Nucleic acid binder design. Structure first.
Length: 580
DNA sequence: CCTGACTCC
DNA sequence: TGGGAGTCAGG
Protein backbone atom coordinates (compact mmCIF):
# COMPACT_ATOMS: atom_id res chain seq x y z
CA UNK A 1 0.00 0.00 0.00
CA UNK A 2 2.86 2.35 -0.89
CA UNK A 3 2.22 3.05 -4.58
CA UNK A 4 3.92 6.03 -6.24
CA UNK A 5 2.26 7.77 -9.18
CA UNK A 6 2.47 11.01 -11.11
CA UNK A 7 -0.57 13.27 -10.90
CA UNK A 8 0.12 14.81 -14.30
CA UNK A 9 -1.02 18.23 -15.50
CA UNK A 10 -0.32 17.55 -19.17
CA UNK A 11 0.28 14.47 -21.32
CA UNK A 12 3.91 13.46 -21.87
CA UNK A 13 5.56 11.03 -24.25
CA UNK A 14 6.32 8.28 -21.75
CA UNK A 15 2.55 7.99 -21.07
CA UNK A 16 2.02 6.85 -24.67
CA UNK A 17 3.96 3.56 -24.60
CA UNK A 18 3.00 0.73 -26.93
CA UNK A 19 1.66 -1.30 -24.01
CA UNK A 20 -0.29 0.01 -21.03
CA UNK A 21 -2.94 -0.76 -18.49
CA UNK A 22 -5.57 1.95 -19.02
CA UNK A 23 -8.46 3.16 -16.87
CA UNK A 24 -11.07 5.49 -18.33
CA UNK A 25 -13.35 5.89 -15.34
CA UNK A 26 -17.11 6.15 -15.84
CA UNK A 27 -18.92 6.01 -12.50
CA UNK A 28 -22.56 6.16 -13.64
CA UNK A 29 -23.90 2.63 -14.08
CA UNK A 30 -25.42 3.67 -17.43
CA UNK A 31 -22.39 4.85 -19.35
CA UNK A 32 -24.27 6.33 -22.30
CA UNK A 33 -23.32 10.01 -22.56
CA UNK A 34 -21.90 9.70 -19.04
CA UNK A 35 -19.02 11.78 -17.67
CA UNK A 36 -15.47 10.45 -17.69
CA UNK A 37 -14.20 11.41 -14.22
CA UNK A 38 -10.56 10.42 -14.47
CA UNK A 39 -7.92 8.54 -16.43
CA UNK A 40 -5.00 6.40 -15.28
CA UNK A 41 -2.18 4.84 -17.27
CA UNK A 42 0.37 2.28 -16.04
CA UNK A 43 3.17 1.12 -18.27
CA UNK A 44 6.88 0.35 -18.51
CA UNK A 45 7.78 3.86 -17.42
CA UNK A 46 5.60 4.44 -14.37
CA UNK A 47 2.11 5.32 -13.20
CA UNK A 48 0.09 8.35 -14.30
CA UNK A 49 -3.21 10.06 -13.52
CA UNK A 50 -4.73 12.44 -16.05
CA UNK A 51 -7.66 14.82 -15.96
CA UNK A 52 -10.06 14.05 -18.83
CA UNK A 53 -10.59 17.71 -19.65
CA UNK A 54 -6.87 17.92 -20.37
CA UNK A 55 -6.23 14.47 -21.75
CA UNK A 56 -9.31 14.07 -23.94
CA UNK A 57 -8.59 17.47 -25.50
CA UNK A 58 -4.94 16.62 -26.20
CA UNK A 59 -4.46 15.43 -29.79
CA UNK A 60 -1.41 13.25 -28.86
CA UNK A 61 -3.36 11.31 -26.22
CA UNK A 62 -6.43 10.97 -28.46
CA UNK A 63 -4.18 9.73 -31.27
CA UNK A 64 -2.74 7.17 -28.83
CA UNK A 65 -6.23 6.03 -27.73
CA UNK A 66 -7.18 5.36 -31.32
CA UNK A 67 -3.87 3.80 -32.33
CA UNK A 68 -4.57 0.08 -32.74
CA UNK A 69 -0.84 -0.73 -32.38
CA UNK A 70 -0.67 0.79 -28.92
CA UNK A 71 -2.04 -2.05 -26.80
CA UNK A 72 -4.22 -1.46 -23.77
CA UNK A 73 -5.19 -3.76 -20.93
CA UNK A 74 -8.41 -2.72 -19.23
CA UNK A 75 -11.39 -3.79 -17.16
CA UNK A 76 -14.80 -3.46 -18.93
CA UNK A 77 -13.36 -1.93 -22.05
CA UNK A 78 -16.83 -1.64 -23.64
CA UNK A 79 -17.83 0.88 -20.94
CA UNK A 80 -14.79 3.01 -21.77
CA UNK A 81 -15.21 2.60 -25.51
CA UNK A 82 -18.86 3.69 -25.51
CA UNK A 83 -18.29 6.58 -23.07
CA UNK A 84 -15.51 7.74 -25.38
CA UNK A 85 -17.74 7.42 -28.47
CA UNK A 86 -20.17 9.86 -26.83
CA UNK A 87 -17.19 12.22 -26.48
CA UNK A 88 -16.37 11.66 -30.14
CA UNK A 89 -13.21 9.65 -29.47
CA UNK A 90 -12.20 6.23 -30.82
CA UNK A 91 -10.64 3.57 -28.58
CA UNK A 92 -8.56 0.92 -30.33
CA UNK A 93 -5.92 -1.62 -29.42
CA UNK A 94 -7.59 -3.18 -26.40
CA UNK A 95 -5.77 -6.53 -26.16
CA UNK A 96 -6.89 -7.69 -22.71
CA UNK A 97 -10.13 -7.18 -20.80
CA UNK A 98 -9.90 -8.34 -17.15
CA UNK A 99 -13.68 -8.31 -16.72
CA UNK A 100 -14.15 -10.79 -19.53
CA UNK A 101 -11.14 -12.87 -18.38
CA UNK A 102 -12.61 -13.17 -14.89
CA UNK A 103 -16.02 -13.97 -16.35
CA UNK A 104 -14.74 -16.89 -18.38
CA UNK A 105 -12.76 -18.29 -15.48
CA UNK A 106 -15.82 -18.43 -13.24
CA UNK A 107 -19.08 -16.71 -14.05
CA UNK A 108 -20.46 -17.40 -10.54
CA UNK A 109 -18.06 -15.02 -8.85
CA UNK A 110 -20.14 -12.13 -10.15
CA UNK A 111 -17.03 -10.08 -10.80
CA UNK A 112 -18.01 -6.50 -11.60
CA UNK A 113 -15.04 -4.54 -10.29
CA UNK A 114 -11.25 -4.83 -10.40
CA UNK A 115 -10.96 -5.65 -6.71
CA UNK A 116 -13.24 -8.67 -7.18
CA UNK A 117 -11.09 -9.93 -10.06
CA UNK A 118 -7.95 -9.13 -8.09
CA UNK A 119 -9.40 -11.31 -5.29
CA UNK A 120 -9.23 -14.35 -7.64
CA UNK A 121 -5.39 -14.11 -7.48
CA UNK A 122 -5.09 -12.89 -3.87
CA UNK A 123 -4.11 -9.41 -5.06
CA UNK A 124 -5.37 -6.88 -2.48
CA UNK A 125 -3.55 -3.63 -3.33
CA UNK A 126 -6.81 -2.16 -4.69
CA UNK A 127 -10.15 -1.15 -3.14
CA UNK A 128 -13.67 -2.04 -4.28
CA UNK A 129 -15.37 0.68 -6.27
CA UNK A 130 -18.32 0.73 -3.87
CA UNK A 131 -15.95 1.56 -1.00
CA UNK A 132 -14.45 4.56 -2.82
CA UNK A 133 -17.61 6.03 -4.33
CA UNK A 134 -20.19 4.98 -1.74
CA UNK A 135 -23.64 3.59 -2.40
CA UNK A 136 -27.07 4.94 -3.23
CA UNK A 137 -27.68 8.61 -2.50
CA UNK A 138 -24.22 8.78 -0.91
CA UNK A 139 -22.53 7.89 -4.17
CA UNK A 140 -20.04 10.58 -5.14
CA UNK A 141 -16.66 11.16 -6.76
CA UNK A 142 -14.07 11.76 -4.02
CA UNK A 143 -11.39 14.47 -3.81
CA UNK A 144 -8.84 14.33 -6.64
CA UNK A 145 -5.98 12.73 -4.68
CA UNK A 146 -8.33 9.99 -3.48
CA UNK A 147 -9.79 9.38 -6.93
CA UNK A 148 -6.34 9.44 -8.53
CA UNK A 149 -4.91 6.84 -6.17
CA UNK A 150 -7.92 4.61 -6.75
CA UNK A 151 -7.68 4.80 -10.55
CA UNK A 152 -3.94 4.21 -10.48
CA UNK A 153 -4.33 1.19 -8.18
CA UNK A 154 -6.91 -0.24 -10.58
CA UNK A 155 -4.54 0.26 -13.53
CA UNK A 156 -1.67 -1.22 -11.54
CA UNK A 157 -3.82 -4.25 -10.69
CA UNK A 158 -4.73 -4.80 -14.34
CA UNK A 159 -1.04 -4.52 -15.23
CA UNK A 160 0.04 -7.25 -12.74
CA UNK A 161 -3.00 -9.53 -13.20
CA UNK A 162 -3.00 -9.83 -17.00
CA UNK A 163 -0.37 -12.61 -17.11
CA UNK A 164 -1.81 -14.68 -14.20
CA UNK A 165 -5.28 -14.50 -15.78
CA UNK A 166 -4.03 -15.40 -19.28
CA UNK A 167 -1.98 -18.23 -17.81
CA UNK A 168 -5.05 -19.76 -16.16
CA UNK A 169 -7.24 -19.26 -19.25
CA UNK A 170 -4.57 -20.94 -21.32
CA UNK A 171 -4.42 -23.86 -18.89
CA UNK A 172 -8.20 -24.14 -19.20
CA UNK A 173 -8.04 -23.94 -23.02
CA UNK A 174 -10.15 -20.79 -22.84
CA UNK A 175 -7.52 -18.31 -24.01
CA UNK A 176 -8.91 -18.24 -27.55
CA UNK A 177 -12.45 -17.95 -26.19
CA UNK A 178 -11.27 -14.67 -24.59
CA UNK A 179 -9.09 -13.27 -27.37
CA UNK A 180 -10.89 -14.45 -30.50
CA UNK A 181 -14.51 -14.44 -29.32
CA UNK A 182 -15.45 -12.38 -26.25
CA UNK A 183 -13.03 -9.51 -26.77
CA UNK A 184 -13.93 -8.99 -30.44
CA UNK A 185 -17.64 -9.31 -29.56
CA UNK A 186 -17.18 -6.56 -26.96
CA UNK A 187 -16.29 -4.09 -29.75
CA UNK A 188 -19.27 -5.19 -31.82
CA UNK A 189 -21.63 -4.74 -28.87
CA UNK A 190 -20.17 -1.27 -28.29
CA UNK A 191 -21.09 -0.38 -31.87
CA UNK A 192 -24.64 -1.68 -31.48
CA UNK A 193 -25.24 0.12 -28.16
CA UNK A 194 -23.91 3.48 -29.47
CA UNK A 195 -25.87 3.22 -32.70
CA UNK A 196 -29.07 2.57 -30.75
CA UNK A 197 -32.54 1.80 -32.14
CA UNK A 198 -34.90 4.52 -33.41
CA UNK A 199 -38.35 4.72 -31.85
CA UNK A 200 -41.56 6.07 -33.38
CA UNK A 201 -42.64 8.07 -30.32
CA UNK A 202 -45.79 9.43 -31.93
CA UNK A 203 -46.89 5.83 -32.52
CA UNK A 204 -45.92 4.67 -29.06
CA UNK A 205 -47.73 7.59 -27.44
CA UNK A 206 -50.91 6.94 -29.40
CA UNK A 207 -50.72 3.25 -28.46
CA UNK A 208 -50.39 4.28 -24.80
CA UNK A 209 -53.40 6.56 -25.03
CA UNK A 210 -55.59 3.76 -26.38
CA UNK A 211 -54.13 1.32 -23.88
CA UNK A 212 -55.10 3.57 -20.95
CA UNK A 213 -58.70 3.60 -22.21
CA UNK A 214 -58.81 -0.16 -22.55
CA UNK A 215 -57.17 -0.67 -19.16
CA UNK A 216 -59.87 1.47 -17.57
CA UNK A 217 -62.66 -0.58 -19.16
CA UNK A 218 -61.17 -3.92 -18.12
CA UNK A 219 -60.51 -2.52 -14.62
CA UNK A 220 -64.15 -1.59 -14.05
CA UNK A 221 -65.32 -4.93 -15.47
CA UNK A 222 -63.14 -6.59 -12.86
CA UNK A 223 -64.56 -4.53 -10.00
CA UNK A 224 -68.12 -5.43 -11.11
CA UNK A 225 -67.36 -9.14 -11.26
CA UNK A 226 -65.54 -8.89 -7.94
CA UNK A 227 -68.31 -6.87 -6.30
CA UNK A 228 -65.77 -4.40 -4.94
CA UNK A 229 -62.80 -2.20 -5.89
CA UNK A 230 -59.30 -3.34 -4.98
CA UNK A 231 -55.76 -2.97 -6.29
CA UNK A 232 -55.60 -5.61 -9.03
CA UNK A 233 -51.81 -5.15 -9.19
CA UNK A 234 -51.47 -6.29 -5.60
CA UNK A 235 -51.16 -10.11 -5.45
CA UNK A 236 -51.95 -9.78 -1.74
CA UNK A 237 -55.24 -7.88 -2.20
CA UNK A 238 -56.05 -10.05 -5.22
CA UNK A 239 -55.57 -13.19 -3.16
CA UNK A 240 -58.11 -11.95 -0.65
CA UNK A 241 -60.65 -11.35 -3.41
CA UNK A 242 -60.14 -14.71 -5.12
CA UNK A 243 -59.62 -17.10 -2.22
CA UNK A 244 -61.56 -15.43 0.56
CA UNK A 245 -64.36 -13.34 -0.94
CA UNK A 246 -65.05 -15.56 -3.95
CA UNK A 247 -63.88 -18.74 -2.18
CA UNK A 248 -62.05 -20.15 -5.19
CA UNK A 249 -59.92 -23.23 -4.47
CA UNK A 250 -56.34 -22.56 -3.36
CA UNK A 251 -54.13 -24.41 -5.86
CA UNK A 252 -50.72 -23.11 -4.71
CA UNK A 253 -49.09 -21.07 -1.94
CA UNK A 254 -45.84 -19.09 -1.78
CA UNK A 255 -43.77 -18.11 1.27
CA UNK A 256 -45.86 -14.93 1.59
CA UNK A 257 -49.40 -16.23 0.90
CA UNK A 258 -51.77 -17.39 -1.85
CA UNK A 259 -50.29 -17.70 -5.32
CA UNK A 260 -51.98 -15.67 -8.07
CA UNK A 261 -49.58 -16.68 -10.84
CA UNK A 262 -50.80 -16.87 -14.43
CA UNK A 263 -50.52 -20.68 -14.26
CA UNK A 264 -52.85 -20.86 -11.28
CA UNK A 265 -55.35 -18.30 -12.55
CA UNK A 266 -55.64 -20.11 -15.88
CA UNK A 267 -56.67 -23.23 -13.99
CA UNK A 268 -59.37 -21.30 -12.09
CA UNK A 269 -61.26 -20.30 -15.26
CA UNK A 270 -63.82 -23.10 -14.82
CA UNK A 271 -64.82 -21.48 -11.48
CA UNK A 272 -65.28 -17.79 -12.25
CA UNK A 273 -64.90 -15.60 -15.31
CA UNK A 274 -63.08 -12.85 -13.38
CA UNK A 275 -59.76 -14.66 -13.56
CA UNK A 276 -59.49 -14.30 -17.35
CA UNK A 277 -60.26 -10.60 -16.97
CA UNK A 278 -57.55 -10.19 -14.31
CA UNK A 279 -54.99 -12.00 -16.46
CA UNK A 280 -55.86 -9.63 -19.30
CA UNK A 281 -55.57 -6.61 -17.02
CA UNK A 282 -52.12 -7.54 -15.72
CA UNK A 283 -50.95 -8.10 -19.31
CA UNK A 284 -52.24 -4.68 -20.39
CA UNK A 285 -50.78 -3.07 -17.28
CA UNK A 286 -47.27 -4.34 -17.96
CA UNK A 287 -47.55 -3.09 -21.54
CA UNK A 288 -48.39 0.35 -20.25
CA UNK A 289 -45.88 0.47 -17.39
CA UNK A 290 -42.92 -1.09 -19.16
CA UNK A 291 -43.23 -0.96 -22.94
CA UNK A 292 -44.96 2.42 -23.22
CA UNK A 293 -44.03 4.51 -20.18
CA UNK A 294 -40.74 2.84 -19.22
CA UNK A 295 -39.64 2.88 -22.84
CA UNK A 296 -40.56 6.52 -23.48
CA UNK A 297 -38.60 7.43 -20.32
CA UNK A 298 -35.33 6.17 -21.84
CA UNK A 299 -35.72 7.52 -25.39
CA UNK A 300 -33.19 10.24 -26.08
CA UNK A 301 -35.59 12.95 -27.27
CA UNK A 302 -33.43 14.78 -29.87
CA UNK A 303 -32.68 11.59 -31.87
CA UNK A 304 -35.57 9.41 -30.71
CA UNK A 305 -33.18 6.50 -30.12
CA UNK A 306 -32.92 4.07 -27.23
CA UNK A 307 -29.46 2.81 -26.25
CA UNK A 308 -29.44 -0.48 -24.33
CA UNK A 309 -26.42 -1.87 -22.54
CA UNK A 310 -25.66 -5.51 -23.27
CA UNK A 311 -24.16 -7.03 -20.16
CA UNK A 312 -21.55 -9.43 -21.48
CA UNK A 313 -20.24 -10.70 -18.13
CA UNK A 314 -23.39 -11.51 -16.14
CA UNK A 315 -25.19 -14.68 -17.07
CA UNK A 316 -24.13 -18.06 -15.84
CA UNK A 317 -24.48 -19.71 -19.25
CA UNK A 318 -22.66 -17.31 -21.55
CA UNK A 319 -25.73 -15.45 -22.74
CA UNK A 320 -25.88 -11.70 -22.98
CA UNK A 321 -28.40 -9.71 -21.01
CA UNK A 322 -29.88 -6.33 -21.93
CA UNK A 323 -30.69 -3.47 -19.58
CA UNK A 324 -32.06 0.07 -19.43
CA UNK A 325 -34.06 -0.68 -21.45
CA UNK A 326 -34.13 -4.42 -21.91
CA UNK A 327 -34.63 -4.88 -25.66
CA UNK A 328 -34.50 -8.68 -25.41
CA UNK A 329 -38.01 -8.98 -23.94
CA UNK A 330 -40.13 -6.89 -26.27
CA UNK A 331 -43.57 -8.56 -26.56
CA UNK A 332 -44.31 -10.86 -29.47
CA UNK A 333 -46.48 -13.76 -28.33
CA UNK A 334 -49.86 -12.01 -28.07
CA UNK A 335 -50.97 -9.73 -30.90
CA UNK A 336 -51.94 -6.97 -28.45
CA UNK A 337 -48.37 -6.75 -27.09
CA UNK A 338 -46.67 -7.58 -30.37
CA UNK A 339 -47.86 -4.21 -31.77
CA UNK A 340 -45.30 -2.50 -29.50
CA UNK A 341 -42.78 -3.58 -32.16
CA UNK A 342 -44.39 -1.17 -34.65
CA UNK A 343 -42.68 1.59 -32.75
CA UNK A 344 -39.21 0.18 -33.45
CA UNK A 345 -38.17 1.68 -36.78
CA UNK A 346 -35.10 2.13 -38.98
CA UNK A 347 -32.80 5.02 -38.13
CA UNK A 348 -32.85 6.39 -41.67
CA UNK A 349 -35.40 6.96 -44.42
CA UNK A 350 -35.79 4.14 -46.96
CA UNK A 351 -34.16 1.67 -44.61
CA UNK A 352 -35.78 -1.55 -43.39
CA UNK A 353 -35.47 -3.89 -40.45
CA UNK A 354 -34.05 -7.34 -41.07
CA UNK A 355 -34.54 -10.07 -38.43
CA UNK A 356 -32.92 -13.51 -38.64
CA UNK A 357 -33.52 -16.30 -36.11
CA UNK A 358 -32.12 -19.79 -35.56
CA UNK A 359 -34.76 -22.51 -35.78
CA UNK A 360 -34.64 -24.77 -32.68
CA UNK A 361 -30.94 -24.25 -32.07
CA UNK A 362 -31.08 -25.76 -28.58
CA UNK A 363 -32.59 -28.98 -29.87
CA UNK A 364 -30.03 -29.17 -32.70
CA UNK A 365 -27.23 -28.59 -30.21
CA UNK A 366 -28.68 -31.36 -28.02
CA UNK A 367 -28.80 -33.71 -31.02
CA UNK A 368 -25.12 -32.94 -31.67
CA UNK A 369 -23.83 -33.22 -28.11
CA UNK A 370 -25.93 -36.31 -27.40
CA UNK A 371 -25.22 -37.82 -30.81
CA UNK A 372 -28.70 -39.33 -30.66
CA UNK A 373 -29.24 -41.21 -33.92
CA UNK A 374 -33.00 -40.69 -34.08
CA UNK A 375 -32.83 -37.02 -33.20
CA UNK A 376 -29.95 -36.38 -35.63
CA UNK A 377 -31.75 -38.19 -38.46
CA UNK A 378 -34.88 -36.10 -37.89
CA UNK A 379 -32.90 -32.87 -38.30
CA UNK A 380 -31.04 -34.22 -41.32
CA UNK A 381 -34.42 -34.78 -43.06
CA UNK A 382 -35.76 -31.49 -41.67
CA UNK A 383 -38.75 -33.38 -40.26
CA UNK A 384 -40.87 -31.26 -37.92
CA UNK A 385 -39.30 -32.19 -34.62
CA UNK A 386 -42.51 -31.58 -32.66
CA UNK A 387 -44.46 -33.75 -35.08
CA UNK A 388 -41.76 -36.42 -34.78
CA UNK A 389 -41.86 -36.50 -30.95
CA UNK A 390 -45.68 -36.70 -31.13
CA UNK A 391 -45.48 -39.83 -33.32
CA UNK A 392 -43.08 -41.52 -30.88
CA UNK A 393 -44.90 -40.53 -27.71
CA UNK A 394 -48.50 -41.19 -28.81
CA UNK A 395 -47.32 -44.06 -31.03
CA UNK A 396 -49.18 -42.86 -34.13
CA UNK A 397 -48.48 -42.33 -37.82
CA UNK A 398 -47.52 -38.80 -38.90
CA UNK A 399 -50.96 -38.21 -40.46
CA UNK A 400 -52.64 -39.02 -37.12
CA UNK A 401 -50.84 -36.37 -35.07
CA UNK A 402 -53.53 -33.89 -34.03
CA UNK A 403 -52.47 -30.27 -33.49
CA UNK A 404 -53.13 -30.96 -29.80
CA UNK A 405 -50.77 -33.94 -29.82
CA UNK A 406 -48.16 -31.72 -31.48
CA UNK A 407 -48.81 -29.02 -28.87
CA UNK A 408 -48.12 -31.45 -26.03
CA UNK A 409 -45.06 -32.83 -27.85
CA UNK A 410 -43.57 -29.35 -28.26
CA UNK A 411 -43.93 -28.97 -24.51
CA UNK A 412 -42.03 -32.23 -24.04
CA UNK A 413 -39.22 -31.35 -26.46
CA UNK A 414 -38.57 -27.97 -24.82
CA UNK A 415 -39.14 -29.29 -21.32
CA UNK A 416 -36.56 -32.06 -21.66
CA UNK A 417 -33.90 -29.40 -22.27
CA UNK A 418 -34.73 -27.84 -18.86
CA UNK A 419 -35.02 -31.17 -16.97
CA UNK A 420 -38.80 -30.84 -16.56
CA UNK A 421 -40.47 -33.37 -14.23
CA UNK A 422 -43.79 -35.12 -14.84
CA UNK A 423 -45.33 -32.81 -12.24
CA UNK A 424 -44.09 -29.77 -14.12
CA UNK A 425 -45.14 -31.15 -17.48
CA UNK A 426 -48.60 -32.08 -16.17
CA UNK A 427 -49.05 -28.58 -14.75
CA UNK A 428 -47.69 -26.94 -17.92
CA UNK A 429 -50.05 -28.88 -20.20
CA UNK A 430 -52.88 -29.10 -17.67
CA UNK A 431 -53.04 -32.82 -18.32
CA UNK A 432 -53.00 -35.98 -16.27
CA UNK A 433 -49.75 -36.50 -14.38
CA UNK A 434 -49.82 -40.24 -15.07
CA UNK A 435 -49.95 -39.33 -18.76
CA UNK A 436 -47.21 -36.69 -18.42
CA UNK A 437 -45.00 -39.28 -16.75
CA UNK A 438 -45.59 -41.68 -19.66
CA UNK A 439 -44.74 -38.96 -22.23
CA UNK A 440 -41.36 -38.35 -20.55
CA UNK A 441 -40.79 -42.10 -20.29
CA UNK A 442 -41.66 -42.67 -23.95
CA UNK A 443 -39.54 -39.70 -25.04
CA UNK A 444 -36.40 -41.16 -23.47
CA UNK A 445 -37.20 -44.61 -24.90
CA UNK A 446 -37.41 -42.99 -28.36
CA UNK A 447 -34.29 -40.84 -27.94
CA UNK A 448 -31.99 -43.08 -25.92
CA UNK A 449 -28.93 -41.01 -26.87
CA UNK A 450 -30.55 -38.07 -25.12
CA UNK A 451 -31.19 -40.20 -22.03
CA UNK A 452 -27.50 -41.29 -22.04
CA UNK A 453 -26.39 -37.65 -22.43
CA UNK A 454 -28.49 -36.60 -19.45
CA UNK A 455 -26.99 -39.35 -17.28
CA UNK A 456 -23.45 -38.85 -18.54
CA UNK A 457 -23.40 -35.06 -18.16
CA UNK A 458 -24.49 -35.24 -14.50
CA UNK A 459 -21.82 -37.87 -13.85
CA UNK A 460 -19.24 -35.63 -15.52
CA UNK A 461 -20.30 -32.66 -13.41
CA UNK A 462 -20.00 -34.73 -10.22
CA UNK A 463 -16.55 -35.96 -11.24
CA UNK A 464 -15.06 -32.68 -12.48
CA UNK A 465 -17.05 -30.10 -10.60
CA UNK A 466 -18.02 -28.19 -13.74
CA UNK A 467 -19.57 -28.58 -17.19
CA UNK A 468 -18.35 -27.12 -20.48
CA UNK A 469 -19.72 -25.79 -23.75
CA UNK A 470 -18.68 -26.24 -27.37
CA UNK A 471 -16.25 -23.33 -27.34
CA UNK A 472 -14.94 -24.24 -23.85
CA UNK A 473 -17.02 -21.96 -21.64
CA UNK A 474 -17.35 -23.46 -18.16
CA UNK A 475 -19.84 -23.39 -15.35
CA UNK A 476 -18.84 -24.69 -11.94
CA UNK A 477 -21.44 -26.66 -9.97
CA UNK A 478 -20.14 -27.09 -6.38
CA UNK A 479 -23.65 -28.14 -5.23
CA UNK A 480 -23.97 -31.13 -7.54
CA UNK A 481 -23.18 -33.62 -4.75
CA UNK A 482 -25.29 -31.97 -2.02
CA UNK A 483 -27.17 -34.43 0.17
CA UNK A 484 -30.27 -32.20 0.02
CA UNK A 485 -32.56 -33.31 -2.79
CA UNK A 486 -33.74 -29.88 -3.89
CA UNK A 487 -30.27 -28.37 -3.98
CA UNK A 488 -28.71 -31.38 -5.74
CA UNK A 489 -31.53 -31.67 -8.28
CA UNK A 490 -31.33 -27.99 -9.25
CA UNK A 491 -27.59 -28.46 -9.87
CA UNK A 492 -28.22 -31.61 -11.92
CA UNK A 493 -30.67 -29.69 -14.12
CA UNK A 494 -28.04 -26.96 -14.52
CA UNK A 495 -25.58 -29.64 -15.60
CA UNK A 496 -27.99 -30.90 -18.24
CA UNK A 497 -29.01 -27.54 -19.59
CA UNK A 498 -25.88 -25.39 -19.43
CA UNK A 499 -23.91 -27.18 -22.19
CA UNK A 500 -26.97 -26.79 -24.42
CA UNK A 501 -27.92 -23.18 -23.63
CA UNK A 502 -24.27 -22.14 -23.41
CA UNK A 503 -23.21 -23.73 -26.69
CA UNK A 504 -26.11 -22.01 -28.40
CA UNK A 505 -24.78 -18.75 -26.92
CA UNK A 506 -21.30 -19.60 -28.18
CA UNK A 507 -22.62 -20.15 -31.68
CA UNK A 508 -24.58 -16.90 -32.03
CA UNK A 509 -21.64 -14.91 -30.64
CA UNK A 510 -19.25 -16.37 -33.22
CA UNK A 511 -21.94 -15.68 -35.86
CA UNK A 512 -21.99 -12.00 -34.92
CA UNK A 513 -18.19 -11.75 -35.31
CA UNK A 514 -18.33 -13.54 -38.69
CA UNK A 515 -21.29 -11.46 -39.87
CA UNK A 516 -19.68 -8.17 -38.91
CA UNK A 517 -16.53 -9.10 -40.85
CA UNK A 518 -18.54 -10.04 -43.93
CA UNK A 519 -20.60 -6.84 -43.77
CA UNK A 520 -17.43 -4.71 -43.49
CA UNK A 521 -15.67 -6.75 -46.18
CA UNK A 522 -18.43 -6.00 -48.71
CA UNK A 523 -18.82 -2.33 -47.73
CA UNK A 524 -22.50 -2.78 -46.84
CA UNK A 525 -24.26 -0.06 -44.82
CA UNK A 526 -26.23 -2.77 -42.98
CA UNK A 527 -25.41 -3.11 -39.32
CA UNK A 528 -26.43 -5.04 -36.22
CA UNK A 529 -28.89 -3.40 -33.82
CA UNK A 530 -29.78 -6.21 -31.41
CA UNK A 531 -29.18 -9.80 -30.43
CA UNK A 532 -32.05 -11.66 -28.74
CA UNK A 533 -30.38 -14.97 -27.71
CA UNK A 534 -31.07 -16.91 -30.92
CA UNK A 535 -31.98 -13.97 -33.19
CA UNK A 536 -30.07 -11.15 -34.81
CA UNK A 537 -31.78 -7.85 -35.75
CA UNK A 538 -30.21 -5.48 -38.29
CA UNK A 539 -31.15 -2.38 -40.23
CA UNK A 540 -30.06 -1.53 -43.78
CA UNK A 541 -30.94 0.45 -46.87
CA UNK A 542 -33.84 -1.15 -48.69
CA UNK A 543 -31.51 -1.89 -51.62
CA UNK A 544 -29.45 -4.29 -49.50
CA UNK A 545 -32.26 -6.72 -48.57
CA UNK A 546 -31.67 -9.14 -51.45
CA UNK A 547 -28.05 -9.41 -50.32
CA UNK A 548 -28.79 -9.83 -46.61
CA UNK A 549 -31.38 -12.47 -47.48
CA UNK A 550 -28.52 -14.67 -48.67
CA UNK A 551 -25.63 -13.40 -46.53
CA UNK A 552 -27.12 -13.30 -43.00
CA UNK A 553 -28.64 -16.81 -42.83
CA UNK A 554 -25.56 -18.29 -44.48
CA UNK A 555 -23.12 -16.72 -42.02
CA UNK A 556 -25.34 -17.79 -39.14
CA UNK A 557 -25.77 -21.38 -40.30
CA UNK A 558 -22.05 -21.74 -41.02
CA UNK A 559 -20.80 -20.17 -37.77
CA UNK A 560 -19.97 -23.66 -36.43
CA UNK A 561 -20.25 -27.11 -37.99
CA UNK A 562 -22.35 -29.60 -36.01
CA UNK A 563 -23.47 -33.17 -36.75
CA UNK A 564 -26.80 -31.66 -37.76
CA UNK A 565 -27.63 -28.66 -39.95
CA UNK A 566 -28.28 -25.26 -38.44
CA UNK A 567 -31.34 -23.59 -39.95
CA UNK A 568 -32.08 -19.86 -39.99
CA UNK A 569 -35.31 -18.10 -40.87
CA UNK A 570 -35.44 -14.45 -41.81
CA UNK A 571 -37.80 -11.58 -42.58
CA UNK A 572 -37.68 -7.84 -43.20
CA UNK A 573 -39.99 -4.84 -43.28
CA UNK A 574 -40.67 -1.27 -42.37
CA UNK A 575 -40.73 -1.85 -38.61
CA UNK A 576 -39.60 -4.58 -36.26
CA UNK A 577 -43.24 -5.67 -36.20
CA UNK A 578 -43.31 -6.10 -39.95
CA UNK A 579 -40.13 -8.16 -40.06
CA UNK A 580 -42.12 -11.37 -39.63
C1' DC B 1 -35.46 -3.02 -0.27
C1' DC B 2 -37.79 -7.96 -1.63
C1' DT B 3 -41.58 -10.47 -3.76
C1' DG B 4 -44.31 -11.83 -7.20
C1' DA B 5 -46.28 -10.34 -11.36
C1' DC B 6 -45.37 -9.64 -16.50
C1' DT B 7 -42.04 -10.03 -20.66
C1' DC B 8 -38.48 -12.67 -23.74
C1' DC B 9 -35.18 -16.78 -25.32
C1' DT C 1 -41.75 -30.63 -8.82
C1' DG C 2 -38.77 -25.91 -15.55
C1' DG C 3 -32.99 -23.78 -17.82
C1' DG C 4 -31.45 -18.46 -18.58
C1' DA C 5 -32.65 -13.26 -18.06
C1' DG C 6 -34.96 -7.54 -16.58
C1' DT C 7 -38.50 -4.27 -15.07
C1' DC C 8 -42.35 -2.97 -12.76
C1' DA C 9 -45.80 -1.81 -8.74
C1' DG C 10 -46.89 -2.94 -4.13
C1' DG C 11 -45.73 -3.54 0.19
Amino acid sequence: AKMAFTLADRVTEEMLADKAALVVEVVEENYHDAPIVGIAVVNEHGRFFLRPETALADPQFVAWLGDETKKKSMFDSKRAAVALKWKGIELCGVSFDLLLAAYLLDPAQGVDDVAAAAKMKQYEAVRPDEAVYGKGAKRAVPDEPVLAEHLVRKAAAIWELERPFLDELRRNEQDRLLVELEQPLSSILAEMEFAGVKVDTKRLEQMGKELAEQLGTVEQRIYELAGQEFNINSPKQLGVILFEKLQLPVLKKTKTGYSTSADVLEKLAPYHEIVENILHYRQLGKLQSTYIEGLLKVVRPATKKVHTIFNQALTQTGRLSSTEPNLQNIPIRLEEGRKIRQAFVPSESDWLIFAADYSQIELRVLAHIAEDDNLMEAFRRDLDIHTKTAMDIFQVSEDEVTPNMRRQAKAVNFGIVYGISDYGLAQNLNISRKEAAEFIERYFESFPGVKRYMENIVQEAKQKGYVTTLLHRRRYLPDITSRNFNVRSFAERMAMNTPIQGSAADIIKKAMIDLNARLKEERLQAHLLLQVHDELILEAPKEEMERLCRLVPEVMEQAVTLRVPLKVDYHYGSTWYDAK
